[PDB]
Write a protein that binds this ligand. Structure first.
Ligand SMILES: Nc1ncnc2c1ncn2[C@@H]1O[C@H](COP(=O)(O)OP(=O)(O)OP(=O)(O)O)[C@@H](O)[C@H]1O
Ligand SMILES: Nc1ncnc2c1ncn2[C@@H]1O[C@H](COP(=O)(O)OP(=O)(O)O)[C@@H](O)[C@H]1O
Ligand SMILES: [Mg+2]
Lengths: 397, 58, 70, 391
């Protein structure tokens, strides 16, 4: 199989104060970008290479004709005929022409067929329908483990699950334990689940496949399980890989006796996902990461220990994690010296990481309200209740 | 093409009609001058709607 | 000859016609129509049609054998 | 206080004054950086997708044209009722997938004896005549089937099911390895058994272990497999599995997670095919059926009728001795010390299913790796059982 993907550019942020150290670094980046551009431009400027075989290729193309419809090789018969299902779904007993690589024909591979008199005339190993292609990460997110405040145990567990096996896994079979196939993140909303997924996708060395969960569902019958199958086939094909299925409760809810055809198809899509998750060995280098807020509403077969062993809890940030988050999100700010930031952290609330980020943004807005950018403590004081909208006093005192 | 299936033109990007109808082609006739009170609400809505769009530099 | 050509153009608006939805306009004379037969086609708009009434998702009748937005 | 909207002068002054002297070049350079990335992405190309072209000199392009002009494709279909042919009604209703269904007569090259209901048949375009029967074939690479002749799990690898494994012994060992006792006792050997219990209890694993120790090959039939894509012909698929079990000296046919099948049009066709392959097949055979479900009552009432399923077997959660035994059997394959109080761990994980115990051992290994120690301690097991158990 081929290798992983998700190329990203340089972290930079070695300085962030625009003290020209950022300028030399971005200048080096842009200069090398110019070097790449000039090199490839001048390569395509002088690159004469074509024809060669030609007439043999010309006649094999003439045999192929135009257009050639791609189909899915469902089954093979004696090595001159096979069973191939067209993208409509109707399948035909067709002949396999001599010039096709009999080694490549394997149930599932996309096979080029003649438009008239269907016949296997070529094999496509890179069908990758646009949906699953989109679900693949190309430009890795800019967030990083430095951007995450707190969640030391969470970062540690997620790295033990989806970094340590891809890097040196000798400890795992040294101890005889299988690597954890699949991890699931859960907790209250805005606690750092999707942020941790971004961070993992940044410091990664494997194909990262971001999935919405609700994206897997498709209108046409059989498109859902087919999409799930293709997604995981791409994951194995580009192994090692990480499949991130955000908001798994979009499909992971309790299984119940389906009546409507749509509910039956949803159940079938989940059954296909679960069967696929069982399909690849835990020794295999494809790991899945699913996040959700309503953990209790999940199917207790999706979270079976034989399927998804790890379960990373994301509690509302504590006071020390709150202060780490505040340090992170006020780092770029030009805070005045009077701000303490400890009064907000003190206030016993349910401030999340997202809530802290919003408090900081609102404080900046309130500073802009007074035409300043130095952001005093009063701006944070008002911003706290500006963002935090909404026990009867002396009950529990 | 008809049945030769030959790419012969490039068409604008696909937006399905159901969501293309969602664009506000014909602007509605309601001004801030017809909104009584809500001055604080209007400023708050503007600080999120137009201030980031008009000037993200701040 | 002009009268004859106008007669031909008028006759191309005869019945039966398949209903479709005018998805988007491409050129002054071509458009993308989603035929009610469940397929989308890149077809040609008849010249005589008022362009201003050609709005997205407006139901349009297409020629049976050419799908042209008649 | 009425807060003033920032004026154009105010915007202009905010953009300057309180700015670093390097805002301009930094922002410009980063913009050109992104633009150059986009240019490289747009012009780097795609590279030829490498269609499945065989190496030269392997091609018979002349004979390829001969086939393309003479040999014809055939649509395949799920054949149905024979219309009671009797050589005067050779027509059969055939179902070409999502396309329609047609009554069609045979080709002269085929005989009616080679055509029966339910099989895939290749039919021509012109007249839809069935031109050749196409058996769905049987291959361990395809489907998910027995894929096992001698499972690697013995009675040693199963613990905490002592009464359970003893009842299973009664079920399978006594008839298979001692037929003479039920011969001279004049009693039919048990015809069917249901191993019903909560998930992760070990049903699958106990079945596999008894298959290994009964000198018969284990059969793995995942239900969702034939509920999903491999549905329909699944009747003929299990037909062939049972037939090969006939050819095989002894098969231990167990249908994994039969909760997926027992709970129905092709599903009913399938379990009536097992009606033909247990009721129709002699009850004396060595290919005994093994039923195991997460939902016991889900099985159709016509299945457990006397003369189809003799016994029902309850896999309960392991006890204290059972939990320590599974802990030992799972830590044997692990790097630990020799003074691990497994009894302590078994006590600390009450009402815990076997899968929870294997996950506890895995987490103990994880904790050992966390400290970068090659040997897990009792402390690691304690914190692991604190983690997994108690949820
Ligand atoms: N520990 C943290 N340190 C820094 N920022 C954090 C932290 N936790 C959350 N945040 C901030 O919260 C924002 C939103 O969080 P995120 O998108 O991860 O939500 P989530 O917890 O996955 O929730 P949901 O999936 O329910 O929307 C992030 O952009 C990030 O800036
Ligand atoms: N009695 C037992 N002895 C040994 N291992 C067991 C026992 N019960 C459960 N297990 C463990 O549980 C895991 C999964 O069990 P499984 O057979 O899949 O459960 P189910 O009966 O629901 O199919 C196996 O890896 C096995 O090690
Ligand atoms: Mg989130």
């Amino acid at each position: 199989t081929k290798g992983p993907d998700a190329a990203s550019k340089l972290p930079l942020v070695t300085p962030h104060t625009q003290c020209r150290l950022k300028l030399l670094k971005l200048e080096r980046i842009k200069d090398y970008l110019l070097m790449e551009e000039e090199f490839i431009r001048n390569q395509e400027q002088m690159k004469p290479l074509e024809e060669k075989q030609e007439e043999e290729r010309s006649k094999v193309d003439d045999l192929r004709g135009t257009p050639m419809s791609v189909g899915t090789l469902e089954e093979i018969i004696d090595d001159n005929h096979a069973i191939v299902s067209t993208s409509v779904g109707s399948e035909h007993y067709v002949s396999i022409l001599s010039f096709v690589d009999k080694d490549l024909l394997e149930p599932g591979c996309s096979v080029l067929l003649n438009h008239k008199v269907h016949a296997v005339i070529g094999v496509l190993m890179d069908d990758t329908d646009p949906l699953v292609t989109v679900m693949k990460v190309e430009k890795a997110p800019q967030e990083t483990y430095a951007d995450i405040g707190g969640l030391d145990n969470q970062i540690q567990e997620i790295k033990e699950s989806v970094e340590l096996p891809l890097t040196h896994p000798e400890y795992y079979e040294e101890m005889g334990i299988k690597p954890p196939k699949g991890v699931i993140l859960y907790g209250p909303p805005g606690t750092g689940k999707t942020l941790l997924a971004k961070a993992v996708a940044n410091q990664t060395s494997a194909t990262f496949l971001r999935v919405v969960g609700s994206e897997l569902i498709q209108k046409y019958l059989g498109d859902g399980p087919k999409l799930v199958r293709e997604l995981f086939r791409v994951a194995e094909e580009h192994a090692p890989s990480i499949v991130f299925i955000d908001e798994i409760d979009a499909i992971g809810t309790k299984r119940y006796d389906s009546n409507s055809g749509g509910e039956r198809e949803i159940q079938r899509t989940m059954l296909e996902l679960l069967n696929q998750l069982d399909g690849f060995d835990s020794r295999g280098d494809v790991k899945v990461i699913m996040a959700t807020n309503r953990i209790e509403t999940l199917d207790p077969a999706l979270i079976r220990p034989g399927r998804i062993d790890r379960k990373i809890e994301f509690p509302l940030p504590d006071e020390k994690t709150k202060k780490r988050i505040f340090q992170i999100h006020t780092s770029r700010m030009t805070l005045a010296d009077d701000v303490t930031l400890d009064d907000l952290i003190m206030a016993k609330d349910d401030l999340s990481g997202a809530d802290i980020k919003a408090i900081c943004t609102e404080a900046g807005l309130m500073a802009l309200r007074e035409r300043r950018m130095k952001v005093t403590n009063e701006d944070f004081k008002k911003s706290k209740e500006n963002v935090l909208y909404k026990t009867p006093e002396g009950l529990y005192l | 093409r008809n049945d030769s299936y030959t790419l012969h033109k490039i068409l604008p990007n696909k937006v399905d009609p159901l969501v293309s109808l969602m664009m506000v082609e014909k602007v509605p006739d309601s001004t801030y001058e017809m909104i009584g009170g809500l001055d604080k609400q209007i400023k708050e809505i503007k600080e999120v709607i137009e201030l980031p769009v008009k000037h993200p530099e701040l | 000859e002009f009268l004859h050509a106008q007669e031909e153009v008028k006759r191309i608006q005869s019945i039966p016609l398949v209903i479709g939805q005018f998805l988007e306009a491409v050129d002054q004379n071509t458009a993308i129509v989603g035929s009610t037969t469940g397929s989308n086609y890149y077809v040609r708009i008849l010249s005589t049609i008022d362009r201003e009434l050609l709005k997205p998702n407006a139901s349009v009748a297409l020629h049976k054998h050419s799908n042209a937005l008649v | 206080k009425p807060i003033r909207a920032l004026d154009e002068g105010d915007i202009a002054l905010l953009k300057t004054y309180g700015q670093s002297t390097y805002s301009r070049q930094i922002k410009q350079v980063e913009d050109d950086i992104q633009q150059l990335l986009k240019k490289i992405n747009e012009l780097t190309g795609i590279k030829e997708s490498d269609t499945g072209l065989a190496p030269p000199a392997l091609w018979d392009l002349a004979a390829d044209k001969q086939t393309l002009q003479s040999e014809q494709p055939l649509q395949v279909a799920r054949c149905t009722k024979i219309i009671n042919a009797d050589s005067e009604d050779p027509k059969y209703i055939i179902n070409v997938k999502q396309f329609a269904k047609f009554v069609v007569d045979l080709s002269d090259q085929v005989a009616p004896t080679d055509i029966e209901e339910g099989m895939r048949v290749g039919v021509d375009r012109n007249k839809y005549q069935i031109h050749i029967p196409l058996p769905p074939k049987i291959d361990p690479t395809v489907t998910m089937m027995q894929v096992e002749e001698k499972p690697d799990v013995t009675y040693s690898d199963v613990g905490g099911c002592k009464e359970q494994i003893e009842k299973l012994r009664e079920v399978v060992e006594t008839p298979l390895l001692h037929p003479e006792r039920f011969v001279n006792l004049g009693i039919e050997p048990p015809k069917g058994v249901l191993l019903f219990g909560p998930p992760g209890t070990g049903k699958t694993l106990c079945a596999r272990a008894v298959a290994n120790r009964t000198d018969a090959c284990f059969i793995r039939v995942i239900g969702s497999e034939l509920v999903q894509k491999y549905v329909g012909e699944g009747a003929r698929m299990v037909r062939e599995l049972f037939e090969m079990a006939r050819t095989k000296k002894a098969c231990l046919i167990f249908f994994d997670e039969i909760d997926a099948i027992g709970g129905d049009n092709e599903v009913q066709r399938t379990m009536l095919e097992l009606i033909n392959q247990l009721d129709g097949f002699d009850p004396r055979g060595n290919i005994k059926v093994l039923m195991a479900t997460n939902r016991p009552d889900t099985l159709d009432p016509a299945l457990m009728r006397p003369g189809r399923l003799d016994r029902k077997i309850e896999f309960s959660l392991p006890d204290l001795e059972g939990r320590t035994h599974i802990f030992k059997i799972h830590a044997r394959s692990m790097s630990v010390e020799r003074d691990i109080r497994f009894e302590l761990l078994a006590r600390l994980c009450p009402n815990s299913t076997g899968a929870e115990i294997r996950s506890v051992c895995t987490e103990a290994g994880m904790f050992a790796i966390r400290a970068r120690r090659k040997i897990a301690t009792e402390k690691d097991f304690l914190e692991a059982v604190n983690k997994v158990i108690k949820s």
